[PDB]
C-alpha cells in the first residue's frame, strides 16, 4: 500500500569533487585508487556535471545508482589516449588492458571518461603520462605494477642497462593540442562499486520515510528491495549481522 525507503542515516557528501576535479590525474601505469565510504553519493549530480564522452556502466544502470547502497566504492583514475579508451572495459585486450589496467570479467561499476585536451596536453608535448609497453604476463584484475626495471626481450641479460634486446618498459604518450582527436588524453575515472549491501556505507540521497509495521509495505531496506509485512521479531541477531535470510 505504501513504500518505506529506510536507508541508513548519514549526511556526508562523497568527495566526487576531489576525484573528477583533480589538477593532476595519475599516469595509467600508476593509476590512483581512492576508497570512498561513509558518505552520501549523488551520482545524478556527477552524471549531469560535464561532457563525459564515455559513461559506460557495467552491471548497474546509471540512473539506478541513486537508489542503491554500496559496501565500497573505488575511484580508479588515470589518463588514457582516445584510441585506448575502448580498452577500459571487461573482456578487452591490448597494451592498456593487459600491461597497465585490467578490469575483471565480473566488473560491477561505471566507467567514466572525458576528453581533457585543455588540461593534459601541452604545445611541446606532455610526457608526464606513461603507459607500460613490455611485461612478462598480462595483469590480473585491479593490479598496479610500477616497476621500471628494463625488460629483457632477448637471451642475453640486460643487467639494468638498456640496449639490444633491452627496452624500457614505460613509453610516454606525449600529448599535444594539435594531436588527433583519437590521440588526445581522456581523463578516465573508473568507479568500482563493491555490491554487497551488508555493511552498506555509500548510498544515494533517497530521502528516507517512517517505518511502517504490521502492514503490507514495499520496503527498500538499505538497498534490499522486495515486498512484505515488517513485523518486529525476537531474532537473536549478532552485533555484526545485518540480514538473516
Amino acid at each position: 500500500t505504501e513504500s518505506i525507503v529506510r536507508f541508513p542515516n548519514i549526511t556526508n557528501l562523497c568527495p566526487f569533487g576531489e576525484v573528477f576535479n583533480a589538477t593532476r590525474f595519475a599516469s595509467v601505469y600508476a593509476w590512483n585508487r581512492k576508497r570512498i565510504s561513509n558518505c552520501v553519493a549523488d551520482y545524478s549530480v556527477l552524471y549531469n556535471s560535464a561532457s563525459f564522452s564515455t559513461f559506460k556502466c557495467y552491471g548497474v544502470s546509471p540512473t539506478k545508482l541513486n537508489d542503491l547502497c554500496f559496501t565500497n566504492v573505488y575511484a580508479d583514475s588515470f589518463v588514457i589516449r582516445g584510441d585506448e579508451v575502448r580498452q577500459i572495459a571487461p573482456g578487452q585486450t591490448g597494451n592498456i588492458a593487459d600491461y597497465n589496467y585490467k578490469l575483471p570479467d565480473d566488473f560491477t561499476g561505471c566507467v567514466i571518461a572525458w576528453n581533457s585536451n585543455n588540461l593534459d596536453s601541452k604545445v611541446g608535448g606532455n610526457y608526464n603520462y606513461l603507459y607500460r609497453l613490455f611485461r612478462k604476463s598480462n595483469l590480473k584484475p585491479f593490479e598496479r605494477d610500477i616497476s621500471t626495471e628494463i625488460y629483457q626481450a632477448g637471451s642475453t641479460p640486460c643487467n639494468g642497462v638498456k640496449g639490444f634486446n633491452c627496452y624500457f618498459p614505460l613509453q610516454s604518450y606525449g600529448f599535444q593540442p594539435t594531436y588527433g582527436v583519437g590521440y588526445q588524453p581522456y581523463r578516465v575515472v573508473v568507479l568500482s562499486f563493491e555490491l554487497l549491501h551488508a555493511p552498506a556505507t555509500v548510498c544515494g540521497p533517497k530521502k528516507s520515510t517512517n517505518l511502517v509495521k504490521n502492514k503490507c509495505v514495499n520496503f527498500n531496506f538499505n538497498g534490499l528491495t522486495g515486498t512484505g509485512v515488517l513485523t518486529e521479531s525476537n531474532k537473536k541477531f549478532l552485533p555484526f549481522q545485518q540480514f538473516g535470510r
Partner: antibody
Framework: QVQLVESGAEVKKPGSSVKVSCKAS????????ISWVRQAPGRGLEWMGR????????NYAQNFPGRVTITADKSTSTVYMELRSLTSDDTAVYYC???????????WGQGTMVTVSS | AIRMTQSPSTLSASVGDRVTITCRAS??????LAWYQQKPGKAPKLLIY???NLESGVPSRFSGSGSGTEFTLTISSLQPDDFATYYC??????????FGQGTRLEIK
C-alpha cells in the same frame, strides 16, 4: 637526494660554439626531463631547451631556431646542451634543471658561467 | 609563445609585513604555474607548483593562489631570509617556457 653537477666555466669568442654538461646523479634518469635555463646578468631567467629521456627526444625554444641541439648519453646519465653561433649577448649562466614529478624545476644544477668575448 | 607579466617588478617591504606579487599570463594556462626564489649567486629554488601547492621543505608562510590568467604569490610573515627575486613559470606550453620578468624584494 638527486644532485646535478655541470661542467666548469667556459670562455669563448663570438662566432664560436659551446657545449655544457649536466651529470644526473641518483634517481631514475629515464623518466625526468632535464631543462636548460640561462640567465644573462641583470636580466631574468630564460628557457633554452628540454631533453626528454623517456621519449628520447630533444626540444628547443622557439626564440632559438636551430641554435640549441641537446643530446645525452643515457649510459652515464649525462646531458649535453650545445649552443651554436655564440655572440656578445649569450654571456649567461646556463643552469640545468630537472623538471621532476610535477613538471616544475625542483632540482637545479650549480650552473656554469659561459663568457663570450674577444 | 605565452608571455608572462609580473607586477610589481620592484617591491619593498619590512620584516613581518604582508607582501603580494601578481604574475599575470597572456593566455589561459589553467593552473600550471610555478613560483621560484633566486637569491643572488645561487640557483633558484622551487616554492610553489600548480599555482597553489607548496614545495616540500619550503616554509609554510609562502602561499599561492589564482588560476586562469592572473596568479598571485603572498607571504604571510615576511622574513629577512625571504628577500630575493621571485619568478613565475608557465609550464603549460613547452615551446617555449616563459619565466616572469623578475620581482626583486628589498628591505624597506
Amino acid at each position: 637526494q638527486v644532485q646535478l653537477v655541470e661542467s666548469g666555466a667556459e670562455v669563448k669568442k663570438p662566432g664560436s660554439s659551446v657545449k655544457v654538461s649536466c651529470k644526473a646523479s641518483g634517481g631514475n634518469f629515464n623518466m625526468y626531463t632535464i631543462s636548460w635555463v640561462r640567465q644573462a646578468p641583470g636580466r631574468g631567467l630564460e628557457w633554452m631547451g628540454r631533453f626528454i629521456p623517456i621519449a628520447n627526444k630533444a626540444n628547443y625554444a622557439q626564440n632559438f631556431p636551430g641554435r640549441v641541439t641537446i643530446t645525452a648519453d643515457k649510459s652515464t646519465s649525462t646531458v649535453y646542451m650545445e649552443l651554436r653561433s655564440l655572440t656578445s649577448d649569450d654571456t649567461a649562466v646556463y643552469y640545468c634543471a630537472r623538471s621532476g614529478s610535477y613538471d616544475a624545476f625542483d632540482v637545479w644544477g650549480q650552473g656554469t658561467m659561459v663568457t663570450v668575448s674577444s | 609563445a605565452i608571455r608572462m607579466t609580473q607586477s610589481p617588478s620592484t617591491l619593498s617591504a619590512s620584516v613581518g609585513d604582508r607582501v603580494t606579487i601578481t604574475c599575470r599570463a597572456s593566455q589561459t594556462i589553467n593552473s600550471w604555474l610555478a613560483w621560484y626564489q633566486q637569491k643572488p649567486g645561487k640557483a633558484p629554488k622551487l616554492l610553489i607548483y600548480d599555482a597553489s601547492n607548496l614545495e616540500s621543505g619550503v616554509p609554510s608562510r609562502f602561499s599561492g593562489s589564482g588560476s586562469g590568467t592572473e596568479f598571485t604569490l603572498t607571504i604571510s610573515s615576511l622574513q629577512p631570509d625571504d628577500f630575493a627575486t621571485y619568478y613565475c613559470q608557465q609550464y603549460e606550453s613547452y615551446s617555449p617556457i616563459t619565466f616572469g620578468q623578475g620581482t626583486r624584494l628589498e628591505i624597506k
